[PDB]
Design a protein around this nucleic acid. Sequence first.
DNA 1: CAACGCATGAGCTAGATCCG
Lengths: 757, 769
Amino acid sequence: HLYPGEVCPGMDIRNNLTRLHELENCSVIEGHLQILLMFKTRPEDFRDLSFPKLIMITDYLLLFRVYGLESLKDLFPNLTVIRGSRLFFNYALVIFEMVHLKELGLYNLMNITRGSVRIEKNNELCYLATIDWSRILDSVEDNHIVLNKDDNEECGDICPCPATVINGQFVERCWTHSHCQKVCPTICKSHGCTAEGLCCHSECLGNCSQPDDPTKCVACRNFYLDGRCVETCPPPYYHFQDWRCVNFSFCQDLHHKCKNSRRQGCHQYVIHNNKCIPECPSGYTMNSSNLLCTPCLGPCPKVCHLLEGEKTIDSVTSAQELRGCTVINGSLIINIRGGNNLAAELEANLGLIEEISGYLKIRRSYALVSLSFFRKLRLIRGETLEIGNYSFYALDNQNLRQLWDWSKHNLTTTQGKLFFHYNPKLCLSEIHKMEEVSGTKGRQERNDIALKTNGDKASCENELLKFSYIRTSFDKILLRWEPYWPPDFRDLLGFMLFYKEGWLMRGLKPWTQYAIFVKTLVTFSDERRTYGAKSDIIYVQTDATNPSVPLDPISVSNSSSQIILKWKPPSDPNGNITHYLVFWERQAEDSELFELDYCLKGLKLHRPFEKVVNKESLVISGLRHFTGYRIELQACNQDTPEERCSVAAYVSARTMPEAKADDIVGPVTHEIFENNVVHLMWQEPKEPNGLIVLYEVSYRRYGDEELHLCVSRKHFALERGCRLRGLSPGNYSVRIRATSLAGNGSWTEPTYFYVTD
Amino acid sequence: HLYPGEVCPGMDIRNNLTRLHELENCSVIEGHLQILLMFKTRPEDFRDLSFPKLIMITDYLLLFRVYGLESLKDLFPNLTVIRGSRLFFNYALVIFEMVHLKELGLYNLMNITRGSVRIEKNNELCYLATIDWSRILDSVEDNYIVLNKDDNEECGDICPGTNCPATQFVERCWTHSHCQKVCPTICKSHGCTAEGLCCHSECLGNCSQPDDPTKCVACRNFYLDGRCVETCPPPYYHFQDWRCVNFSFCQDLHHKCKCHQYVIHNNKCIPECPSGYTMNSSNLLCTPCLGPCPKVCHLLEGEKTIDSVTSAQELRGCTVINGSLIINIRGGNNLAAELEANLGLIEEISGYLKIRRSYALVSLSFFRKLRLIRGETLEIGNYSFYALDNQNLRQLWDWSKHNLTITQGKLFFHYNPKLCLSEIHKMEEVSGTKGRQERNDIALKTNGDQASCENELLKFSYIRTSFDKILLRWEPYWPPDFRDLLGFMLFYKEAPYQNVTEFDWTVVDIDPPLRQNHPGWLMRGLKPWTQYAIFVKTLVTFSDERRTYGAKSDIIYVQTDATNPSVPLDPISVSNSSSQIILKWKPPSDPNGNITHYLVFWERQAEDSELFELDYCHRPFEKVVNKESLVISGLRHFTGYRIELQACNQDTPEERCSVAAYVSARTMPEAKADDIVGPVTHEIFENNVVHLMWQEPKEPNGLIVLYEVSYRRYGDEELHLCVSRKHFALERGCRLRGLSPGNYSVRIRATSLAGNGSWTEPTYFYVTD
DNA sequence: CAACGCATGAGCTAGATCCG
């Protein structure tokens, strides 16, 4: 058989050896195998337990802080291949800080598919250089075996194997003193092999029983199917974990196995391209029954589940299970007390909830002030009914003020009743604002909401405040409305205003939309006969001002005439930014750089526009080599009606210089004066990059030492060349070079000025 | 002028039209005067009228949201002198959130002695840039004309002339029908008429006749019987920095209004008494008082309002209250702190009291001297007490220090959710308002719900500080129900401060104790040598009644200990000379308490011999006490030295120091020391053989690569010799095997690697053949 | 039976009575 054993999940073992008993019959371990932090263990209990039927390892194997093992070949005698499906700490196999391991004993590995091996801090291992990872590890450039007992060649390293010649030495590669590393002829690289050199079936690996058979070798390459395995099995089975393919009847249960959210370590397995993949990627969503992923036309939502038909959310950690739940087949109850940073975390965990199919409870809810975080909720149909024929229930909402906006949202509901009691901040005209949208005036039913239980800490049960005038600026809005007077005008103490993203309210934001209304406050006459008012929920949106500068522009060159730019959008667009405007201008050369002798200490160191739209980069072309460019950035939001925008963002650029443009052109002319001073003339390269600053002349007699001369820019300018003093008669090999602002060019021919001896 | 009308006490204008014609018969105002919340009356109802019947007010002025006023000459068209002994906002004038006005009426007001000017938060207000603040009082830098809508000079302001004397802003003016009297800013506050100069000379505000000190309505020095002498001669006494009045006139000034009362004190016949001096109504002079003394404090009209955070009304020392008090302070988000800013010094309140927006305080302990309420003045609704918006108050006063009794006034317990009803019933009995059958309106549907006043403390049963963590355990706490225990919520945070708050603290929750076991907490990794403030609170189940049985352990400051120091940061050993090297570093990243010294070792590293023979042919220690530098000497040219460096914090009971750091650096080389020395002796022969004998360089200079022997001839090619170590050692220099005729010269320069030496003198030898 | 050894000390493996 190929794999006659049993499947085996990945586990973790720590502080004991009791949970290793569950490997009695399982052969292939998907996931990884980590055994760590085991201390009070004798070395003697390791010589009686064995696992002869373990072969396949998918992700990685990790041994860490083991006490008592001297040779792990007694524990893992028959594993051959490590798939390395998941790299662990950028490794596929790590043996670390082992205290007793005399020898490794891993004599059956043939091919590490992906990853590398790491052995560290093991002062007890030998034969570590007799492994020949190159024949097993397809990637040796990541091997890391340092600080072991073989740091010094002191542990023997004797063994009875061809003694391969992969390096320049006849290194003999053995695993232990009784086994060598098996190397057969390489006519097939990883196609399986026998002890007689007969290559087995092409699509399998490692040890083998009969050659050229895909049914009786050991480990194969791509997949596996019932004693056979082909590179791509037919699609009555869908590929699974890139090593198998199985009928959809198998893993469709696994989708239903943890559809009850008992463990978040699983995935809602989906079918996509004959891969029972955990999630079909972004731009794809799930249908109900077919388990195939829909192309997700436009933005689409994602799903999880609720808890036992009734899930209670106390804080964000309770709502963490409801992360990304779109449809909920049950009831829901929310009890939020408070915490830290309650601004947008509640809208992040459940800002994509689509539907709830039971009854909603807002009992004991105080930290909220509004239920606007069900932005995507559309319907509460409620198949199950709360006792008392209820489907909406709310008590003890001391600060709850706004249920939902019926201008920007449409609620619907079908059956059940409502309950609004002891919600003082919650008004009465607002709970009269849902029955037109929720439609409970239809299928007309007698709901039970008390007239007195709401309107406390406000006064709105009677009238509806009316605005009179609104006027919006870039940062402020005035709010003058119609004056409301109770029948006893002395009873009105004042007004209170709520706003969230006459009176002068000053703290606004450009291009931001707010919700505003006005609430009255009156006292109570000695009959329990209150008055009051609430204006309707009115949206106010600000206007557009000029944005800010484009943040942190950067500009790197990739050629002799190319600058590419990268910046950031301005912090406040203050409206839809249509485009950008970019100006670049040349900075020729710093003229004060002309007057320094550089061979003394070292180195001292309108306009065109481009309109880039809906982008954050720009490739500038047609530029001079090695010339500093100054770049101005405009982020302009509105263009057609007399465009306006921000202050320019300033950034500098330099083009990469050309290398050939610095060589001295032509032979360097020599002039011989009778007084042993010579005139060496050359012409400066016609297109310097920045500046040609120094000249390196090197006159040398063949067979004698060389003495360098620095020809300064001033000396070349004032004298046109170099007057080379102190020159004995005879022929000289003279090398001439011009040092520029970029680097060296090339030496000229050896300038031969010769006089016959 | 000349005070032609009668003197009147304070007044206030509210909510009506008929009462806007009263100051036409009052000339001197002694008391407060305010106009605010003008909502019942519409713009058209107001009337415009000018009357020269007002010359002085002795207290502050305030405007706040007046709807429908079109000119300020309607009530104050002759007001000349304003100064107050009782301040409000600390300013003599307060213009706040007023709207629907486009012109003023104070074209004569130019005397300001007491208080400053605050022009802030004024919407739709004009004529605030056609006023020379350097003319009305001291120049603009002492006045807060900010937060307004005339800081940018809004509205079109028309000043007559563009009569108006020589000066949005077109001229200084206050009304379309009246002009600001403008004169050089040198007068500053001396005031002036329309003459382009100080009114008379040293006047203050305005003068009836220019060039006469007698007719100064007020002057910068004290006025006495037609003069403005610098100080008041006896028996006259100083009177508000502008008058001299004798003791009889000092008494007669206030006896006439029988208002404000003036007493002789510090030669200042001013309306004041020193601290804790009550009143004796025989001459209304200051008389000594003991204990809680309300002394001088204006409570006329039997009521007083507080809508400011700072004012000179409840800080003078007026403990006993004979009037009413209403709190309407604008701005902020905690009236509990706003209330404390006004009544911090007063601990006994005999008048009207109420609290709103209780926060940052759970119990009241600032009213421990209140033990009697008079109620002689009737309170609004006969209620001397209101309770409302008490969402943070958990406990009331004790009944061994407060001992309040109410002789007139009624109770109001509404919207007190956090306070439990146990304290509420104690109020009714101690105050005895329910015991006087006086009607108390009590709302226990909104009170005694969501309440918690059980604040039992827990004590840390057993604690352990360690160098980086601290174990803490507290006694097993069981509320009245064993099931009613949701564990504990220990709050801790690093707090080397001895004044730290928990309202701004990492929280750990602890399982309920075994039903035992001591519930405790061990921190999981902390900075060594750090102080931590730790406390527990018991988390318990709350019933539908919301009755709290939890406990709250107190804050404990327990400090983790120190550990080994961190390495001396940035350890650099660089050469400063050929024979000395220096080591430099920085104090440890984690000093772990006081540093006692820096443990630093060093030693010499030599050069191996095979470097020389290559041709190309205990340990010394230092102790650095709280210093980041090390200098060592006695070193050799071009020699490497490794220097161990550590940092220590404690060395008396144990050697606890940072782990070692090593820097290996070499002293600078001596290039000149490679120069050839020693007698260059020649053995010249006639068979083209010359024996060369030059000596080794003066200094070893590290490895010596070779010896450069360059024997040359003038007219022939130059020949170089690479004298190896073996060659030099065996030949005592060099020998010339085969030569050419002529006087040869050889320059010798030994080649080492310590820099490069210099070519010695060319030693001539005449080769012959 | 009252620091250390049979880890390290906040870099996918626990979190300092975390283990005895």
